[PDB]
Design a protein around this ligand. Structure first.
Ligand SMILES: CC1(C)OC(c2ccc(S(N)(=O)=O)cc2)=C(c2cccc(F)c2)C1=O
Ligand SMILES: [Zn+2]
Length: 257
């Protein structure tokens, strides 16, 4: 039932999922007066060499690139829990115009889109057991701003034409997610939640300081997707983002000065 419409969007989710009003919900605004530099934070490193992409899918509220997460060398490492996190999936959230679309904000600034690279902490065995733990997932969040094109994004935005409607799936092998990363891996981190139902508070959020630049042509391709299935009335897939939630007692930590 849940979606991003007026009558089933973020403001409605709490009715089915009471945790929507919990103590560790995401996304949040990152106020740069209040993030505390933490010299103990382990810097991020990626081993995406053997990351093995499988397929890309339109599930009716986003598109997901699925990975073979049995590749034990394809991991994100570091962060507050010094974790080793298996890459399993990535997806985006975006807006109906360039001035909005991101889920996290920085000093209340919204970006055009946000990329979420989803990983599960290997010490919990599989993604299913991981989402039961407060630090079970590491989601690497990366802001998208409009400017020059991102060459590593081209394979992603171009295949979207093949999965325009809900339910469409396409083989998507040999995609290298290193092509989606900015130069710097300086980051903010805080304990939070999935930003869609079931809104489980199982995420160590790692949000990169540096946005990637993508072209207007690239972002437009996001907005050609459909929420609806083939033959149904056309509803363009836009504004599939949850707004910032109460920070409550949490401290946002910065890896950088
Ligand atoms: C249904 C349930 C629990 O929700 C999510 C989910 C993940 C990330 C986000 S988000 N937007 O990044 O916070 C929101 C939701 C997954 C999931 C998806 C891909 C890989 C994985 F290991 C788990 C689930 O299995
Ligand atoms: Zn997401």
């Amino acid at each position: 039932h849940w979606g991003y419409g007026k009558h089933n969007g973020p403001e409605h989710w709490h009715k089915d999922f009471p945790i929507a009003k919990g103590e560790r919900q995401s996304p949040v605004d990152i106020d740069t007066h209040t993030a505390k530099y933490d010299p103990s934070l382990k810097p991020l490193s990626v081993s995406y060499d053997q990351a093995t992409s499988l397929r890309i899918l339109n599930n009716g509220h986003a598109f997901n690139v699925e990975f073979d997460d049995s590749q034990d060398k394809a991991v994100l490492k570091g962060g507050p829990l010094d974790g080793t996190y298996r890459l399993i999936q990535f997806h985006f959230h975006w807006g109906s115009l360039d001035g909005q679309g991101s889920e996290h904000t920085v000093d209340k600034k919204k970006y055009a889109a946000e990329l979420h690279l989803v990983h599960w902490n290997t010490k919990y065995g599989d993604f299913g057991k991981a989402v039961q733990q407060p630090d079970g997932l590491a989601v690497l969040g990366i802001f998208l701003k409009v400017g020059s094109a991102k060459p590593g994004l081209q394979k992603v935005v171009d295949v979207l034409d093949s999965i325009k409607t809900k339910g469409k799936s396409a083989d998507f092998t040999n995609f290298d997610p290193r092509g989606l990363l900015p130069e710097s891996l300086d980051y903010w981190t805080y304990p939070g939640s999935l930003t869609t139902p079931p809104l489980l508070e199982c995420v160590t959020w790692i949000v990169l300081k540096e946005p990637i630049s993508v072209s207007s042509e690239q972002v437009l391709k996001f907005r050609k997707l459909n929420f609806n299935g083939e033959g149904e009335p056309e509803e363009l897939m836009v504004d599939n983002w949850r707004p910032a939630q109460p920070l409550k007692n949490r401290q946002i930590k910065a890896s950088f000065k």
